[PDB]
Write a protein that binds this ligand. Sequence first.
Ligand SMILES: O=P(O)(O)O[C@H]1[C@H](OP(=O)(O)O)[C@@H](OP(=O)(O)O)[C@H](OP(=O)(O)O)[C@@H](OP(=O)(O)O)[C@H]1OP(=O)(O)O
Ligand SMILES: [Zn+2]
Length: 1002
Amino acid sequence: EKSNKSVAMDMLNEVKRCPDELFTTLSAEKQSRFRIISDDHNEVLMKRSSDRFVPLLLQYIDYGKLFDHIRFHVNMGKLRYLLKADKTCIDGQTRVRVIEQPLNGFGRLEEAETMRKQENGTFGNSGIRIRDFENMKRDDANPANYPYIVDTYTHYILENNKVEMFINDKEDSAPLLPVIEDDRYVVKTIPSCRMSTLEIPAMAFHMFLFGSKKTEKLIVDVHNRYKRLFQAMQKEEVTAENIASFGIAESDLPQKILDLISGNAHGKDVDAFIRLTVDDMLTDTERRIKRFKDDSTGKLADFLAKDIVLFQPSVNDGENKITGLNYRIMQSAIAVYDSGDDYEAKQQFKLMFEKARLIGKGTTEPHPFLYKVFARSIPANAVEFYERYLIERKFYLTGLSNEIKKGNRVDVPFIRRDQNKWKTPAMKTLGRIYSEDLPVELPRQMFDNEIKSHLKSLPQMEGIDFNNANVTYLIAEYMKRVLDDDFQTFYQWNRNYRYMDMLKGEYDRKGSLQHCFTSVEEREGLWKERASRTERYRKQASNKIRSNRQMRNASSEEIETILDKRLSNSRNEYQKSEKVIRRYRVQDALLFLLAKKTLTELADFDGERFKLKEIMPQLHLPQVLADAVSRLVLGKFGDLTDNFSSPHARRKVLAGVVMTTGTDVKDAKVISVSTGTKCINGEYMSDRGLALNDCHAEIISRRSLLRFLYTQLELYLNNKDDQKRSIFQKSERGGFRLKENVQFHLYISTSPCGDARIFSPHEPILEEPADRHPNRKARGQLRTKIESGQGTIPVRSNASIQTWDGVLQGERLLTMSCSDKIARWNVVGIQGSLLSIFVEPIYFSSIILGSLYHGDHLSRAMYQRISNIEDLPPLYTLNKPLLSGISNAEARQPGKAPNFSVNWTVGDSAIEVINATTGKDELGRASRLCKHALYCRWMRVHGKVPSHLLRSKITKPNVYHESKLAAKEYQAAKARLFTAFIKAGLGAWVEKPTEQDQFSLT
RNA sequence: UCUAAACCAUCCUGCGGCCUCUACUCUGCAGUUGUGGAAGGUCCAGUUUUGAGGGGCUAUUACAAC
RNA sequence: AUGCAGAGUAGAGGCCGCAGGAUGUUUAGAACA
Ligand SMILES: O=P(O)(O)O[C@H]1[C@H](OP(=O)(O)O)[C@@H](OP(=O)(O)O)[C@H](OP(=O)(O)O)[C@@H](OP(=O)(O)O)[C@H]1OP(=O)(O)O
Ligand SMILES: [Zn+2]
């Protein structure tokens, strides 16, 4: 419920808040001063969400009953009627068609509101039901539910910075509500006259000085002068001789009246306009063609729908052109169009434009060039359609330009020669339009002369030049000189503007332009000096762009244009903002004055003292198995090195493989043990397969496990009694398979280099969450050890393939990281290609780290990154082994990393010591683990296996690479793996030069 | 066996400048035709702290018709 | 309502530039089996 008192209090609570335009310019400290704590201990931003000056003033006049005759334009809801429940649209789909009309009228907000909603819930004297606000079925298709009126509280219509009003002849007139006819037409009333919202401060000021009745008489008198003028025009009784008699200043007459009496009445030149429009549009078309080739279908469809309708010829008062619903459908249809080169879908898309009568035979108003878009072929999607549309537009406009250049007359659909725009205006015709068809446009400065005459009589105003004094100025002088008041303190606070930053030309040490907060006095002075200061600004700013590495310095236009737009936009933003804030000041003065007047005359209140200046705002237990394998590997190593005393007992990384045959830890056997941290030097690659390429422990321990597997196949093939002791058995699928209970577990002293280690090279502080950046592209990426360099490096940075001659000259040899190699084992198996011709894929059940264990990283590295692996050949799978750290992590081994690498397989009398730099032992002899040795074992086993018992029966020559290729399924699993990594965007595997595996056994 | 210096080019943590996606909130705009530039919005340069003028360009407010 | 544009806030990335740590080689010295 509003009242005189409530409006007064709404005004005072308006002026304590910061205007939004001001708030933007203030320092954080001063912005903080509007953030208030309420009574109920709640923080409130005391900032204006909109300029409510004008509605507040209208409420003041209405509730005050201050105008006897003038009533403001109110809206009281919308009428909705159902035109058709089943309307076939241009896409041939049926939709409801609802039409809305606003219920606009004139009266005091309270009186109009009392009329709007009857007790029976109907609108005014219409009979038509007002639908409850909670009911929101806008798509409702039931004719019985229509017509209805949307429930909306009476508000003033305040659009386009205008206030529209109706002048009643008699006082105490009732609200003027629109009549509804045929449950369909809302019969509305042209306003008497329309006032700029920028005129409302002067009206308020006039009201405050003279009284609302004197204010009202003036508006009505001005209105009646315009009406008398427009009546005389219709009688052709307006001349240069008598124009002054109408009582309206030249600057408040339309130019056409001034042209007409001066004998200079003219239309615009349509041909010039056509020539200009065609050229402008051709240029724009080429701009759009270029931008698109250089570079949202929604954005495309917006352009296309507007343009298609622009080029649609109008006939019959425009009744033929595309209507609202069909427009929305056309635009949306385009936005989502994407056939798939489906013929029917293409036909359907073309048909839409046929039904809109834009293309096709028998069309009378076709689009001039759209049909060319569909000549030869229908475009497949919105993007193809936009391109073809623009090309065809270019050809059409070029044709027109060429005809214009020949001096010929051309016509475009959207320029219409019959519009008055192009004809000479007539007095009598124009008289009628001004009198009958439109509201009177009230002039600016209508209250100025009266305001100034009053103020001239006040002795406090004696020393002001009223010949250079606008009403904004005079309100402020009134507050200061008659009332000893001033604006709110926050209009003196320093403000920030980009434009003023540029003009001040102040940079911080990094080189960025500083945000200054200036006073109004400072800005006055910067503005005076803007020419010089703009020169300086541009010089520096151009260098900043020119210093940037991108090369656009040869072109002259590029930079100057960028800066032109920068300075224009900034300058315009600053000027408008400053002008508007100056309006907020005097608006606030007026609200304060009016509110204070209301409250003074209400109750025991002595408010003369108050001033605006004062206003302010599970088979095993994980850890048991982990610690078992850890102690057993470490222990077997301690045995082989004479209690870690032996010459080669020094190690940095240690690894090993443990076999389990059952849950009994008295059934755990150490299969192999190894140490090493280096890879071969490039000069020492062996084309006979006699060197070890990678001596990182875990890699060596797998190779030792291969030896053990060979030994077991031989044990089985030796004799029947031995078959019982061998871990292998025949498979019904052909070849050999492990016994049901048999499992292998890998143990490494430390995380495998690469994805499991690079990000987390330190021991986790326990209970720590995963890495804070798990989505970086670095994560999961394949990595290589790089020859003669530290760290493990993405494969993407070395895309080329490795060549033998290349490495030899000094290209650095790349070896896949241990993380990548073990993930590979978790797909293709640990046995490798050659054993896969005899045995079924074998996987590690567990990977156990003695230090540097990060499950988040280890799991990603070991399998998670390639969970998108598909089409694995039979018996292959993405193995997910038990991952675990140990109970008591190992200490950093002290000293420098030995250049040697130690191996041992179960059954061996001694360890073997290899120089990782050379791939060979101290005396330069080949390893029992080298390619050649393993090929030798493989050849002997091959000779002993009856050909019916082979998993792969492919026969190839006895070259290592060929023999590996015999393992067709394994190679296919390897291809699945590589594709998994690539498709996950983790880079392509790097292999050795193809010469590496091209040797025979002598 | 221990220590010092240098290189390789990635990774982590923090701080700047620039560009994108995801989620949430708010505002603006969204058929054609006719009339109308006194008004509202926009731009130009010896323009204003004074919603005041000047010169170029513009149908947004409203009305009826479909 | 739905779609298109603009602004704000938080998160996650990409590029450019700084500071401090982490991670296979090269050049020396001391000392030892
Ligand atoms: O990881 P490593 O133990 O060092 O050995 C492997 C193994 O080669 P060898 O068993 O012949 O030593 C791979 O062969 P498979 O057993 O999986 O069949 C081979 O891959 P290819 O099959 O493609 O030859 C790969 O070499 P690369 O991947 O570099 O081509 C090579 O690793 P290294 O090259 O690092 O020794
Ligand atoms: Zn490694």
